[PDB]
């Protein structure tokens, strides 16, 4: 049972607009709390979670300091678009993407489990900080350019400094100040629907609404036999109020609904539930 502070950067040039765009959002667990986007007048870091409406009280410069860090980040990765685009001898015509993901996994009492910093170029892994946090792995030759540059500049020492101290300390800050939102386990409202296809076939759907965090496991069983491979599993979706929804369906011979049972696993439930359909 760990918690995570994660930051997601995206810089991309698009065909019909000179000057690339930069988006920078941060998550605690499955809760977004901050954003930055350079497509604004004076682009600023802004709150996207209720407990961050209060953060100016304990840290009046948080918004100014984080606006500074993101506006600089926007600049370095717009040049990075040009650099990597040149490594691959690509032309100015195309549209390309640099993504960054960095953060930390912390255990029960301020215990750093893992730290990471990863970069993708056009959606493929480019360079990443190793788990030891003192070395990198580069994907291809063009990434070796970067790794050799970063090795020279000893940028891992600066990275591990943030990840070992600042990342941990800010996760704990956010978990305490956003207790009502972050340290919460909302079990799902589960119920099964029945939709016939023909005289002999039926679709049984197992819903799960309003659960947090996002991790969940829906499972259909037939007389205790596992039926995951015959299952139709929707991808879990947000509901707009900070929670998630998901369903699993499976097709069954009509008049035999009651031999099949849905199985729900969620952190917010006292123990997994096995469901059944009833007229």
């Amino acid at each position: 049972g760990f918690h995570s502070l994660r930051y997601f950067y995206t810089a991309w040039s698009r065909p019909g607009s000179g000057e690339p765009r930069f988006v920078a959002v941060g998550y605690v667990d499955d809760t977004q709390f901050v954003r930055f986007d350079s497509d604004n007048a004076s682009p600023r870091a802004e709150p996207r979670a209720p407990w961050m409406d209060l953060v100016e009280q304990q840290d009046p410069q948080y918004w100014d300091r984080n606006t500074r860090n993101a506006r600089d980040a926007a600049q370095t990765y717009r040049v990075g678009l040009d650099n990597v685009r040149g490594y691959y001898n690509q032309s100015e015509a195309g549209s390309h993407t640099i993504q960054r993901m960095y953060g930390c996994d912390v255990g029960p009492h301020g215990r750093l489990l893992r730290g990471y910093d990863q970069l993708a170029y056009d959606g493929a892994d480019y360079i990443a900080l190793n788990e030891d946090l003192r070395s990198w792995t580069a994907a291809d030759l063009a990434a070796q350019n970067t790794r050799r540059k970063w090795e020279e500049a000893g940028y891992a020492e600066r990275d591990r400094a943030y990840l070992e101290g600042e990342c941990v300390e800010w996760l704990l800050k956010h978990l305490e100040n956003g207790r009502e939102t972050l340290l919460r386990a909302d079990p799902p409202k589960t119920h099964i629907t029945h939709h016939p296809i023909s005289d002999r076939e039926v679709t049984l759907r197992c819903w799960a609404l309003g659960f947090y965090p996002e991790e969940i496991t829906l499972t259909w069983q037939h007389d205790g036999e596992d039926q995951t491979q015959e299952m139709e599993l929707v991808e879990t979706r947000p509901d707009g109020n900070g929670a998630f929804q998901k369903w699993a369906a499976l097709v069954v011979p009509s008049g035999e609904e009651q031999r099949y049972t849905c199985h729900v696993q969620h952190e917010g439930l006292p123990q997994p539930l096995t469901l059944r359909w009833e007229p």
Partner: peptide, 9 residues
């Protein structure tokens, strides 16, 4: 905080 040091690739 956003990390305060980004190195260009």
């Amino acid at each position: 905080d956003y990390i305060n040091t980004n190195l260009v690739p």
